[PDB]
Design an enzyme around this catalytic site. Structure first.
Site, PDB file in Angstrom:
ATOM      1  N   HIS A 197      38.530  37.866  36.415  1.00  0.00           N
ATOM      2  CA  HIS A 197      39.607  38.467  37.224  1.00  0.00           C
ATOM      3  C   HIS A 197      39.376  39.965  37.440  1.00  0.00           C
ATOM      4  O   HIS A 197      39.553  40.499  38.555  1.00  0.00           O
ATOM      5  CB  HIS A 197      40.953  38.324  36.522  1.00  0.00           C
ATOM      6  N   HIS A 252      37.121  35.080  30.657  1.00  0.00           N
ATOM      7  CA  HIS A 252      38.008  34.628  31.726  1.00  0.00           C
ATOM      8  C   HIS A 252      38.703  35.817  32.404  1.00  0.00           C
ATOM      9  O   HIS A 252      38.661  35.986  33.646  1.00  0.00           O
ATOM     10  CB  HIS A 252      39.020  33.686  31.076  1.00  0.00           C
ATOM     11  N   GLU A 253      39.313  36.692  31.587  1.00  0.00           N
ATOM     12  CA  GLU A 253      39.956  37.878  32.148  1.00  0.00           C
ATOM     13  C   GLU A 253      38.938  38.814  32.783  1.00  0.00           C
ATOM     14  O   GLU A 253      39.208  39.397  33.835  1.00  0.00           O
ATOM     15  CB  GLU A 253      40.785  38.615  31.093  1.00  0.00           C
ATOM     16  N   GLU A 266      41.418  32.612  40.667  1.00  0.00           N
ATOM     17  CA  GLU A 266      41.106  31.693  39.589  1.00  0.00           C
ATOM     18  C   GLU A 266      39.636  31.275  39.617  1.00  0.00           C
ATOM     19  O   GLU A 266      39.046  31.042  38.558  1.00  0.00           O
ATOM     20  CB  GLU A 266      42.060  30.489  39.636  1.00  0.00           C
TER      21      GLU A 266
END
Length: 493
Positions: A264, A260-261, A290
């Site tokens: 980003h 997830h990170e 997101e």
């Protein structure tokens, strides 16, 4: 060009201060010794005040107004000037008394939220929240809006977002995901307790580093550290840092936090260094950011194709935990859907009901149709009606999320927007990149990163979220993409 260069110099100085603040906040989460907290807060506040002084300076406003009338400038320069002028004038709308009142009420809400959680009673928080809501309605009148006052706050956190658009999307969430949840609830329970066996911490750490490398994270322009709540922070495109957390008895945590990170971080590492400090060097919006985290975490990171390559590797890493678990069992276990009480723990289907409930409540708080009196009962009724769960106390209910105590109204919808953009973008990538699925199933994520780097990452704020989605996909944001992705994973085996 002299005047544009002066604009760039001013903005880059402001960005230097803001990135110094980011360094101090990163250290606050990772390495700060406990007794240093007070001075660290003071230092961040001093720098924040300086940054604000610079961005409200009259000379900057005069420069922006002069540059707005320069038809000579190229498309990127003109967009930078226009967006920076919008950013600048927003502050000039607010009366000083309202700014001070909002600051005081936010302090009071912070303290009241802490003590309300510790007493496990929403009524402790209720007066501070009532004050906050009153000030937020005043703020809607200061910002201006059409049709619904809440649009003023939605627009703050996602330029373009509004009640008409979000009502349509969340009606689709209800009408399409409720039947899907009914179907899922009749399914036979899946094996899954292997995810709560013991997973060596050092092996997990190296697994996450390896996955980030394979995704394309440049670890000469970034690094990973441990923090309490995973996040991504950029000090510039060449210094983009991520954090993760490891649970040795829950394999579900770290691996997907890291992916997830990573999503980003790949975005931040793709913004142009020459646009540092300028709108065309910043992420397009919270929703688009997101979408990057969710596209990698879920549309890739929870997919069968991803695990065809990754599963034998993690089996080799954790053979005592996974050596008697099949690829299908693992895939089903990492895609477990279950109505639950806490938004931050929710699976990717039920998550959106959490967001919908917050959206409806915020929309009623800001238009005046819902009061803060007995908001815990309202919250609990929403949770029972839509998720079929019975809130047992206020910390498991209305007091779970910090956003309102921070004054962050209009923020929650961006989480769902991110997920829905992720699905629309990934499905489009599967159409536009010929061998994308085969590449993923063979462990090569470079074609996907290349597509993102050509279509999303380098534009900064040049396109709004809508313009970006229309340019890439030929459509505005359509929940149907998320629905087809979710139904395909959850409904036909």
């Amino acid at each position: 060009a002299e005047q544009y260069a002066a604009y760039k110099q001013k903005m880059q100085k402001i960005a230097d201060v803001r990135n110094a603040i980011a360094v101090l906040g990163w250290d606050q989460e990772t390495y700060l010794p406990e007794k240093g907290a007070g001075f660290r807060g003071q230092q961040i506040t001093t720098l924040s005040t300086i940054a604000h002084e610079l961005f409200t300076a009259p000379e900057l406003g005069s420069l922006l107004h002069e540059l707005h009338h320069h038809p000579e400038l190229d498309a990127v320069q003109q967009k930078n000037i226009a967006l920076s002028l919008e950013d600048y004038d927003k502050n000039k709308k607010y009366p000083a008394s309202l700014v001070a009142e909002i600051s005081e009420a936010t302090n009071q809400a912070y303290h009241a939220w802490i003590k309300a959680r510790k007493a496990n009673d929403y009524q402790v928080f209720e007066p501070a929240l009532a004050r906050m809501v009153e000030l937020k309605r005043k703020e809607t009148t200061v910002l201006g809006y059409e049709d619904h006052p809440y649009n003023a706050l939605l627009n703050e956190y996602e330029k373009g977002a509004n009640v008409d658009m979000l009502d349509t999307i969340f009606t689709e969430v209800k009408t399409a995901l409720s039947p899907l949840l009914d179907d899922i609830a009749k399914q036979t329970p899946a094996r899954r307790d292997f995810l709560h066996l013991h997973f060596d911490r050092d092996k997990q750490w190296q697994l996450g580093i390896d996955l980030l490398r394979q995704m394309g994270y440049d670890m000469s322009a970034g690094r990973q550290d441990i923090s309490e709540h995973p996040f991504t922070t950029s000090f510039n495109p060449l210094d983009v840092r991520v954090t993760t957390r490891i649970d040795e008895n829950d394999f579900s945590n770290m691996t997907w936090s890291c992916i997830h990170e990573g999503g980003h971080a790949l975005y931040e590492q793709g913004l142009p260094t020459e646009q540092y400090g300028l709108p065309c060097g910043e992420a397009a919006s919270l929703g688009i950011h997101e979408s990057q985290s969710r596209l990698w975490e879920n549309n890739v990171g929870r997919s069968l194709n991803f695990w065809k390559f990754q599963y034998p590797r993690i089996q080799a890493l954790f053979p005592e935990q996974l050596g008697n678990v099949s690829l299908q069992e693992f895939y089903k276990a990492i895609n477990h859907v279950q109505p639950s009480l806490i938004r931050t723990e929710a699976d990717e289907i039920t998550y959106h009901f959490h967001i919908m409930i917050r959206y409806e409540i915020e929309k009623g708080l800001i238009d005046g149709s819902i009061s803060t009196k007995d908001l815990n009962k309202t919250w609990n009724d929403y949770y029972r009606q839509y998720l079929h769960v019975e809130v047992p106390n206020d910390t498991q209910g209305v007091l779970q999320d910090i956003h309102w105590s921070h004054g962050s109204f209009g923020y929650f919808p961006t989480y769902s927007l991110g997920s829905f953009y992720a699905a629309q973008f990934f499905t489009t990538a599967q159409k536009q990149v010929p061998d994308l699925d085969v590449s993923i199933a063979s462990g090569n994520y470079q074609p996907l990163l290349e597509w993102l780097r050509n279509n999303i990452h380098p534009f900064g704020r040049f396109y709004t979220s809508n313009e970006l989605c229309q340019k890439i996909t030929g459509n505005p944001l359509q929940f149907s993409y998320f629905l087809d992705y979710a139904a395909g994973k959850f409904l036909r085996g």
